[PDB]
Design a protein around this nucleic acid. Structure first.
Ligand SMILES: [Mg+2]
Lengths: 72, 312, 53, 158, 92, 101
RNA sequence: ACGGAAGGGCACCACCAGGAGUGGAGCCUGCGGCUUAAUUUGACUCAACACGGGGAAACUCACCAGGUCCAGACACAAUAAGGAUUGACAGAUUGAGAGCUCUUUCUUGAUUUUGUGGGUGGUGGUGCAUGGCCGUUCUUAGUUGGUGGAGUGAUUUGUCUGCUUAAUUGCGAUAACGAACGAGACCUUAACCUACUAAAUAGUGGUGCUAGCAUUUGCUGGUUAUCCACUUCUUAGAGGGACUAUCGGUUUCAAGCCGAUGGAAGUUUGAGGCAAUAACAGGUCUGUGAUGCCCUUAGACGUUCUGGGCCGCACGCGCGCUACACUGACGGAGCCAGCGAGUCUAACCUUGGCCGAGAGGUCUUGGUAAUCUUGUGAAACUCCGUCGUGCUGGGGAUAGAGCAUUGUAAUUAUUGCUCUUCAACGAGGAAUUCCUAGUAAGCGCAAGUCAUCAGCUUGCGUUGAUUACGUCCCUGCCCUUUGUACACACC
C-alpha cells in the first residue's frame, strides 16, 4: 500500500445540510383569524401540530421516522 | 492466622468487667461494667465503629462483676456487688427476678444448659444455687477464702448423666462440685497465689486456672490430673477458650496473650497502643470472651473500651 | 443506518473474543475460560492453574 | 446457582484475576499488594492489602464505598452482599509487589537507577529477608538496551 | 456527537444518585443494562465529561470505571437538581 | 428431625480435611448416626498451551493443573441444629451447600 | 576461541548391532517459484517449512473491487431561536429496504456545523530503539564472592594429580580456609499395603420376592435403596515401606562397582516439573487499553457492509495419511480398556421407543455429573467361511448421478450416505530420521480448534518385539595440556 488512485468518479459531495430556507411556519393569516393549511396527522401520538408534506399526490409527515402515509 | 485491629466500642463509664456472647445472634454482645449497668451491643461487621448499643440495663447499685447470656440470646444474668443477682431480657430491659440472700458481694453467676438453674459464687465463701423463680434451692460451703470465679462445665453429650460446676477462690485451690448431689468431688491443689480466674474448655474436659503469680496451669477433670504449667511473666486477669479452634487466651497485665495449646507456643503478644498513657501503668484487659463463630475475640479494657481482635 | 452491524455474529472466531486483551486468536474456552492463550499463561497462578508435572 | 463445580471453581479463580488487575491499576499509588476473596453466604467480603490504608479509607468513609459500588455494578452482585475492608500489610519490606511498586515510583520521581535500587535492596535486608535481587532492564542511559542487577544475600532457584 | 438531550439527563442522573458507572466497553451494545439508553451514548457522554474533568476513568478487562469527582458534583448539582444533596456514599 | 446432606468442594486439601473433621467434630459430641465423609475421586483440570507467544522455537508444550477435591456427608438432625452448623464452618477456599432433602 | 594437535570421559537430537521407516506411488498439509485485482503476512541449518495454537465459506482478515459512519473529546472564533443541525415517505440512483446522493417538503432542534489547535484509533513501519515471554548456546556440569597466597599487571589459586559418579558426585591430595548459586535435595505422577480412617454417587456376600434348568440341599440370573453385614476389589485422608537390605567378590582398602538371595519396587525405582553465571543485534510491535520514535487520522492506514482471496498451478522441498496384499481382503460370531468432556434464562453430552438401506428424521428421558451419556460393548485381535498368486475380490486416486446434516449463505465440490467410474503403486537410488523395555512398532479413543469440517496436535489405554549393555569411527559436548600472526574470535 503506497497511495490511492481513486478510480471512483471524484465525489466529495456531502448531504443536504438541512437546507437553509426562509421562515416557514404559516397556517394562513387573514385580516386576524387563522385557518389550517397543510393539514395535520391522524396519528394519536400527533396532537395536530405537524404538517403533512405534499410532493406528488402523496402526504408525508416528518414526525414519524419513516411512514405517515395517508394518500389523497 | 493473625488477630488484627478491627474497632473499638465506647459505651461505658468504667472498666468492662465482663463480656459474654450467645450463639442465637452473632451480632449480640453483653457487657457488664463498673458503672452499675449492662450494655448490650449490636454489631454490623464494618470499620472501626463496628456498630451501636441496642439496650442499656440499669438497676444495680454497685459494680456489675460478671454477666452471662443464655443460649437463645434473649435472657441475660448479671452478678453485681450489691449482694443481688438480676435476670434480664435484651428486649426491653425489664428485670424479671432478683436473687437476694448473699450477705456480701457476688463475683460470678452462671446459667446451666436449657435454662434449668443458676449457680453463683460470692464473697461470703459460699456457692449459692438458685431457681429461676428467685428461690435459692441449695447453699454450698467449704471454701475458707472467698470465691473469686465460678463456672459450669459444658457437657459435650446433651445432658448425658449429670452437670458439674467448678470453683476458684483466693485459697490457692480449685473445687469441683456436682450440684445434683450438692457434693464436693475434686480438690485441685498446686496454685501458689490467689486464683482470680478459671475457664473450662468447650470440650468439657480441660480446665485452665490462673492467678496473681501469673501462671496458667491446666487440669483435666475427666481424669482428675494435672498436665503442665506455663507462665505469662506478669499478672493475669481473665481467661477465654475458643469454641471452634484450639486456642487459649489470657488477659494479662502487660496486655493480651493468646496461646496455641496443641504445640504450646505464643502466637503474637497482642499490644494495642492507647495514644499516650506513658507515665503510669498502661491499660490492660480485665475480661474477655471468644465469639460464637470463634473468628472474633472481644476484650474489655480499663479505659472504657471493648476492643475486638479478628483473625484474617 | 441498518447496515452498520447488520452481519450476524453467532459463531466462529468473530463472535468469541478474549476478555482481557480483546483478541480472537488463540482463545482458550475450556471450562468457560474465554481467555487468550498468552493471557492465560500470565495469570494462570492467579486463576489457580499451577504446574506440577 | 446451577453451575457445574468445574465451571464454578474456574469462575471465582478468574474473578480474583479481574479484581487483582483492577486494584493494581486503580490503587497503584497506595502500595497495593493483593486481595483475598471470602466466599461465604450472608454478605461475602473482600479484603484489600495496601500500605496506605488512610488513603484507601477516604475522608468520612470515602474512597472505599465508591470502590465497593464499582465492584457491585461490574460483577452484578446483590446490593449489600459485598463489602470491602483494608488491613495494611504484614512486613511490607518482605513483599515484592510492594517493593516493585516502590522501585517504579522512585524511578518515576527522577532518581538514578543505581541509587534507587541500592536503597530498595538495603531496606529489604533491613526487613529481615534472607536474600533479595533487583533487576532493571531496558534502554537505561544509552540507545542500546542493557540489564544490570543488584543482589544481596543469596537466592535459590531449584 | 449527537447525544440527544433527554438521554443526557438520565446518564447524568445516574452519575448523580450513584456516581459510579462501569459501562461495558463494547460499542453498539443495544440497550446498556443500567441506564436504558445506548451504551455508545453512555461511553461518549462520560468521555465528554472526562476531557474537561469532573470524573476519573480507569479501564481494565474491557470495562470502564467512571467515578464522580468533587469538581463534578457541583456542576452536576445545578445541571440536574437542587443543593443539599449527597451524590456519592458520603452520607454515612 | 430431617435428613440432610452436606457437600464440600475444595481446591485445598488442608483447608478441606480439618473442616470436614470440624463438621464431623460437631457431630459426635452428641450422639447421632453419621454416614460420614465419602470422598469422591479428585478432578484434575488440565490446560495445555504451548509455552510461548508466536510459534518460533522448539515446540515446547505445557500442562496447567487445577485439582478439585469433593466430599459429602449425609446427616439427619432436627431443624434448630441444622442452622448453626453451616454458619460456624466458614473458611477460605471451600464452598458448602446443604441439600434439604 | 579455534586446530585435518595430544590425553581423559560422555551422548540413539552420534555411531555400533538391529528395528520401524522417510526419500519411490496416490492423496492433504505447510514453504518456495509462477500467476493474480489480491493470491495479506512473520519465520529460512540445528535453533524456518501439520509453526504463528494458522483444521480461513461470512466473521477472523491484516489483501483486492466497491458503499457507509465519526465513535474528530475539549478550548477559541464564526454562523445560529427572522433556525446552529439531525432524520426520512415515494421516485431516480445503488449489489442493495444505505435519504448514500439527487427531485419534493416534512420533522428535529442548540447536543450540533465550518474554521483554527488538538484528541483518538491503527493486525501501519521499526523486535537493529524496547518491556514481558519463549527458543537456543546447553539432554552439559558448570558459575561466583570474602579473607589469605602468587604476579608490576591483565589475571591466577581456591574451582585439583589420581580413583569414582548421571553430576565441580564424592574419597582424598593440597597455599589455601570458610562459603553461595547450579546438581542433588525438593514437588507431582505410576507402582506395594487383607494395617487404620467408611462409602446407595464404588463394590462384595447373605437375606426376602421371583425366572430358567435340575430336581437332591445346586448353577446362571433379575429385583433402585426389601433388609442385614464387610471394605478384598474401587475411592482418598493420614501413614508405612528402599536406604542399594543381606551375603559373596574386587579397589590404595575409601568413595564406589559387580554377582546372588530376599523384596511390590535395586538404572537416581520409572517418568516428569523446577532449574545456574554469561550471552544471541535468535523470534515476537500480527496476544495485550506493554510501549518509545516515524507515518496516517475523514476520499482514514480507523471502523463497518457487500463480493472475492488466503485453496489460485508448467515445477522444486519439508511434516504426514493410505497402500503395494495370503502374517491378507471380504462376510458373519466372540467381545476387551484408559485419559477426559457435557446445558439457566440455553439449547450441551444424549439413553430409550418409532420411521428410514444409510446418512439421518421424530417423541420423550437422565445428567451442572464416582449418579446419566458410559461397562464410552474402540480398533488391531480371535474362530468359522468365501477368495486363490491373477495390478485380482490388494489399492481407492480421479470422476458422474442422487439423498441428508450444520450454517444467513455449501458454487471454487463444507461434511456425511447410496450406486457407478477402478489410475499410479510389485517393497522404493543417492541420501536420511527416530528409537534400548511395557520401549520401538501396530491399533484405536478422549480433549484442543468447533457451527460444519482432523489425514494435525496434547494425552490415553490395547497388542507388544529384534538388537547393545559398548566405542569415540562419523557428528557434537565437558575437563586438562599444548600451538596460535585468531578476539567480528576458522564462516
Ligand atoms: Mg500521680
Amino acid at each position: 500500500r503506497k497511495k490511492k488512485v481513486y478510480t471512483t468518479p471524484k465525489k466529495i459531495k456531502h448531504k443536504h445540510k438541512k437546507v437553509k430556507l426562509a421562515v416557514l411556519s404559516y397556517y394562513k393569516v387573514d385580516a386576524g383569524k387563522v385557518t389550517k393549511l397543510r393539514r395535520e396527522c391522524s396519528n394519536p401520538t400527533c396532537g395536530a401540530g405537524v404538517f403533512l408534506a405534499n410532493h406528488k399526490d402523496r402526504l408525508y409527515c416528518g414526525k414519524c421516522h419513516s411512514v405517515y402515509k395517508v394518500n389523497a | 492466622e493473625v488477630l488484627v485491629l478491627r474497632g473499638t466500642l465506647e459505651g461505658h463509664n468504667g472498666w468492662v468487667t465482663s463480656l459474654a456472647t450467645s450463639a442465637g445472634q452473632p451480632n449480640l454482645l453483653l457487657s457488664a461494667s463498673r458503672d452499675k449497668t449492662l450494655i448490650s451491643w449490636k454489631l454490623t461487621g464494618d470499620d472501626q465503629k463496628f456498630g451501636v448499643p441496642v439496650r442499656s440495663f440499669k438497676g444495680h447499685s454497685h459494680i456489675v462483676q460478671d454477666c452471662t447470656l443464655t443460649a437463645d440470646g434473649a435472657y441475660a444474668l448479671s452478678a453485681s456487688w450489691d449482694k443481688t443477682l438480676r435476670l434480664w431480657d435484651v428486649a426491653t430491659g425489664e428485670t424479671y427476678q432478683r436473687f437476694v440472700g448473699h450477705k456480701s458481694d457476688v463475683m460470678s453467676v452462671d446459667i446451666d444448659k436449657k435454662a434449668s438453674m443458676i449457680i453463683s459464687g460470692s464473697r461470703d465463701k459460699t456457692i449459692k444455687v438458685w431457681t429461676i423463680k428467685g428461690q435459692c434451692l441449695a447453699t454450698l460451703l467449704g471454701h475458707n477464702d472467698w470465691v473469686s470465679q465460678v463456672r459450669v462445665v459444658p457437657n459435650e453429650k446433651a445432658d448425658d448423666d449429670s452437670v458439674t460446676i467448678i470453683s476458684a477462690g483466693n485459697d490457692k485451690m480449685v473445687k469441683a462440685w456436682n450440684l445434683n448431689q450438692f457434693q464436693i468431688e475434686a480438690d485441685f491443689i498446686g496454685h501458689n497465689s490467689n486464683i482470680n480466674t478459671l475457664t473450662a474448655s468447650p470440650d468439657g474436659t480441660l480446665i485452665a486456672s490462673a492467678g496473681k503469680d501469673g501462671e496458667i496451669m491446666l487440669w483435666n477433670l475427666a481424669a482428675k490430673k494435672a498436665m503442665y504449667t506455663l507462665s505469662a511473666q506478669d499478672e493475669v486477669f481473665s481467661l477465654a477458650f475458643s469454641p471452634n479452634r484450639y486456642w487459649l487466651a489470657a488477659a494479662t497485665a502487660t496486655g493480651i496473650k493468646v496461646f496455641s495449646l496443641d504445640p504450646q507456643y505464643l502466637v503474637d503478644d497482642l499490644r494495642p497502643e492507647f495514644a499516650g498513657y506513658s507515665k503510669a501503668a498502661e491499660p490492660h484487659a480485665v475480661s474477655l470472651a471468644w465469639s460464637a463463630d470463634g473468628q472474633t475475640l472481644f476484650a474489655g479494657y480499663t479505659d472504657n473500651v471493648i476492643r475486638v481482635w479478628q483473625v484474617m | 443506518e441498518n447496515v452498520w452491524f447488520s452481519h450476524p455474529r453467532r459463531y466462529g472466531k468473530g463472535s468469541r473474543q478474549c476478555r482481557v486483551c480483546s483478541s480472537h486468536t488463540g482463545l482458550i474456552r475450556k471450562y468457560g475460560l474465554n481467555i487468550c492463550r498468552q493471557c492465560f499463561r500470565e495469570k494462570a497462578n492467579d486463576i489457580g492453574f499451577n504446574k506440577f508435572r | 446457582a446451577l453451575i457445574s463445580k468445574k465451571r464454578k471453581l474456574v469462575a471465582d479463580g478468574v474473578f480474583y484475576a479481574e479484581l487483582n488487575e483492577f486494584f493494581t491499576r486503580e490503587l497503584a499509588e497506595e502500595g497495593y499488594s493483593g486481595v483475598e476473596v471470602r466466599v461465604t453466604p450472608t454478605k461475602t467480603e473482600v479484603i484489600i492489602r495496601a500500605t496506605r490504608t488512610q488513603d484507601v479509607l477516604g475522608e468520612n468513609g470515602r474512597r472505599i464505598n465508591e470502590l465497593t459500588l464499582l465492584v457491585q455494578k461490574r460483577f452484578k452482585y446483590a446490593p449489600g452482599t459485598i463489602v470491602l475492608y483494608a488491613e495494611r500489610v504484614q512486613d511490607r519490606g518482605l513483599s515484592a509487589v510492594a517493593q516493585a511498586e516502590s522501585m517504579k515510583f522512585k524511578l518515576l520521581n527522577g532518581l538514578a537507577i543505581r541509587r534507587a535500587a541500592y536503597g530498595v535492596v538495603r531496606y529489604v535486608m533491613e526487613s529481615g529477608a534472607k536474600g533479595c535481587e533487583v533487576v532493571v532492564s531496558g534502554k537505561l542511559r544509552a540507545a542500546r538496551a542493557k540489564a544490570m542487577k543488584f543482589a544481596d544475600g543469596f537466592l535459590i532457584h531449584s | 456527537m449527537l447525544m440527544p438531550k433527554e438521554d443526557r439527563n438520565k446518564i447524568h442522573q445516574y452519575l448523580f444518585q450513584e456516581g459510579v458507572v462501569v459501562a461495558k466497553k463494547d460499542f453498539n451494545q443495544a440497550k446498556h443494562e443500567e441506564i436504558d439508553t445506548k451504551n455508545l451514548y453512555v461511553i461518549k457522554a462520560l468521555q465528554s465529561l472526562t476531557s474537561k474533568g469532573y470524573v476519573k476513568t480507569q479501564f481494565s478487562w474491557q470495562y470502564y470505571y467512571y467515578t464522580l469527582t468533587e469538581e463534578g458534583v457541583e456542576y452536576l448539582r445545578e445541571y440536574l437538581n437542587l443543593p443539599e444533596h449527597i451524590v456519592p456514599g458520603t452520607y454515612i | 428431625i430431617i435428613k440432610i446432606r452436606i457437600t464440600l468442594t475444595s481446591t485445598k486439601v488442608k483447608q478441606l480435611e480439618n473442616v470436614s473433621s470440624n463438621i464431623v467434630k460437631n457431630a459426635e459430641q452428641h450422639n447421632l448416626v453419621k454416614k460420614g465423609p465419602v470422598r469422591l475421586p479428585t478432578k484434575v483440570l488440565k490446560i495445555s498451551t504451548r509455552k510461548t507467544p508466536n510459534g518460533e522455537g522448539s515446540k515446547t508444550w505445557e500442562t496447567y493443573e487445577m485439582r478439585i477435591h469433593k466430599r459429602y456427608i449425609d446427616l439427619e438432625a432436627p431443624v434448630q441444629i441444622v442452622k448453626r452448623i453451616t454458619q460456624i464452618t466458614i473458611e477460605p477456599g471451600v464452598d458448602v451447600e446443604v441439600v434439604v432433602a
